[PDB]
Design a protein around this ligand. Structure first.
Ligand SMILES: *[C@@H]1O[C@H](CO)[C@@H](O)[C@H](O)[C@H]1NC(C)=O
Ligand SMILES: *[C@@H]1O[C@H](CO)[C@@H](O)[C@H](O)[C@H]1NC(C)=O
Lengths: 48, 304, 97, 97
């Protein structure tokens, strides 16, 4: 249970991006710029 | 317009301990049946607040200009309901803008202007005999007003003048906060009776209003209602005309609180992280029923 | 199967023109600020007209801004020499900033 | 800062539908899922909730001020039962949950 919790809770973190939700990223920023923020989110989520 | 009243003798200060009292919902987001830990401005869980016996009755009055620092918790309880508003500001004069909130039996008004507030402000009412009814025309709170940039009106949210006496003490609680150009006010209202005039029970403050007003505030003072009486020349008396009143004031601090949102989406239990080592355990474990054992709550280093 | 959109039915327009062509502009040391809220803004008009030399958006893309909602908008106004325009940007060091 | 929105864009609010996976956009917050009537109320002017994560569990309709709950729509892994290509070619699919 602990592991699962701490996995799902890691979705709340943004790992240095401007937001923790991909929907906010893709609604606020254009693809060429949102690419780097999504890169940060991808790296953080993959590591977790 | 201007009116002044002073007392040579000054009522002494008084400190009183404060229990769980003073917990408010930290965010506008909703939650339910979950334990959530968040850092925000709360008054320490067991905190020595300043209790003011503002009006006593052979009678004396208190008009203090209390300090303000990153939020304030206010509490009161009385049948007369003398308290009828607040004033906030860096200087409380025309030199800079200042905030005023006033309440009546039918509406609540809020304004931001360079008010020239008096040193002993109050709102006066008297029983007009011609109209055979109470009248309110003595706004002795301020001397002048200018540059009325921001104004707002709302309902009499908690001006309920219940006609009950005895074991029906009514408690009104408020929290004022200033964050990034927002003056945000939470409040709660509940009848409870205890030996002391502030119960140890646990309840949460709901968000009352939010004003998007940018201002620097470090001072504030209460507003009290004075019921004038027809003092004829034979009496040859004049001065304060109001019943006894008192309240409690406390200063918020940046703390981490763990709150227990119930099934109905209500918080009825919370713990302060820094209050006690046991509360540190409860916070780090994100629970209230800590099992027997030894826990690495946190870490400490001798500071330089 | 379907996509829905829900916004409050605020049938009012509050363009920023009253601030943009304000005849008098405050000094930089006394930069003017205006708060706008509770209204619908058509941001397209802002960037659809060839009337602005620099239009730089930080943390949000101008194209998508017509499909976003916000709590409040603070419009700041001042005047500076063109060479120092770049100083108005986060993370910039200079006397003006 | 996840607060009620007062500034919006020029987008007409479409009709609200329930019981089917839809791509929703409520006063700025965008997502997708099935929408239903929530089983409990918020504070008098508390307008959405959350689950253990930042994913939204409930939302208040900005048009009708009605409470609603959101659930991710039917999803899951898919596997297939195959007795071996070198013995047959039919296969039976299995949707996990
Ligand atoms: C929560 O809601 C249920 C169902 O309406 C009710 O029975 C219960 O009393 C509520 N909780 C409290 C603390 O009143
Ligand atoms: C706007 O929405 C409110 C809330 O339902 C409704 O009462 C009102 O009639 C609506 N006005 C228009 C013009 O649609």
């Amino acid at each position: 249970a602990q592991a699962l919790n701490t996995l799902v809770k890691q979705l709340s973190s943004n790992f240095g991006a401007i937001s923790s939700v991909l929907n906010d990223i893709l609604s606020r920023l254009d693809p060429p710029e949102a690419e780097v923020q999504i890169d940060r989110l991808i790296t953080g989520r993959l590591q977790s | 317009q201007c009116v002044n009243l002073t007392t040579r003798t000054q009522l002494p200060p008084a400190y009183t301990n404060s229990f769980t009292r003073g917990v408010y919902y930290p965010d506008k987001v909703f939650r339910s049946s979950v334990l959530h830990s968040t850092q925000d401005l709360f008054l320490p869980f067991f905190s020595n607040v300043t209790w003011f016996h503002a009006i006593h009755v052979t009678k004396r009055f208190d008009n203090p200009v209390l300090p303000f620092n990153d939020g304030v918790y206010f509490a009161s309880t009385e049948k007369s309901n003398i308290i009828r508003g607040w004033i906030f500001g860096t200087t409380l004069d025309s030199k800079t803008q200042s905030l005023l909130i006033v309440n009546n039996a039918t509406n609540v008004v809020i304004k931001v202007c360079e008010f020239q507030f008096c040193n002993d402000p109050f709102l006066g009412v008297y029983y007009h005999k011609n109209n055979k009814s109470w009248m309110e025309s003595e706004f002795r709170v301020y001397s002048s007003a200018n540059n009325c940039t921001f104004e707002y009106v709302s309902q009499p949210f908690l001006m309920d003048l219940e006609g009950k006496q005895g074991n029906f003490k009514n408690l009104r609680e408020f929290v004022f906060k200033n964050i990034d150009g927002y003056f945000k006010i939470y409040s709660k209202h509940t009848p409870i009776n205890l030996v002391r005039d502030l119960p140890q029970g646990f309840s949460a403050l709901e968000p009352l209003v939010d004003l998007p007003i940018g201002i620097n505030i470090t001072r504030f003072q209460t507003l009290l209602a004075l019921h004038r009486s027809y003092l004829t020349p034979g009496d040859s008396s004049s001065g304060w005309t109001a019943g006894a009143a008192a309240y409690y004031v406390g200063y918020l601090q940046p703390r981490t609180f763990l709150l227990k949102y119930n099934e109905n989406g209500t918080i009825t239990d919370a713990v302060d992280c820094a209050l006690d080592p046991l509360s540190e355990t409860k916070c780090t474990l994100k629970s209230f029923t800590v099992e027997k054992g030894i826990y690495q709550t946190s870490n400490f280093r001798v500071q330089p | 199967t379907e996509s829905i959109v829900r916004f409050p039915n605020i049938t009012n327009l509050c363009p920023f023109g009253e601030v943009f062509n304000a005849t008098r502009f405050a000094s930089v040391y006394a930069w003017n600020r205006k708060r706008i809220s509770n209204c619908v803004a058509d941001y397209s008009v802002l960037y659809n007209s060839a009337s602005f030399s620099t239009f730089k958006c930080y943390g949000v893309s101008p194209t998508k801004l017509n499909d976003l909602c916000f709590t409040n908008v603070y419009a700041d106004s001042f005047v500076i020499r063109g060479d120092e325009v770049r100083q108005i940007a986060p993370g910039q060091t200079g006397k003006i900033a | 800062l996840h607060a009620p929105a007062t500034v919006c864009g020029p987008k007409k609010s479409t009709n609200l539908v329930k019981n089917k996976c839809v791509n929703f956009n409520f006063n700025g917050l965008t997502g997708t899922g099935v929408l239903t009537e929530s089983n409990k109320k918020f504070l008098p002017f508390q307008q959405f909730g959350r689950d253990i994560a930042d994913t939204t569990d409930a939302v208040r309709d900005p048009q009708t001020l009605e409470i609603l709950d959101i659930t991710p729509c039917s999803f899951g892994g898919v596997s297939v039962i195959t007795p071996g290509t070198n013995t047959s070619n039919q296969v039976a699919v299995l949707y996990q949950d």
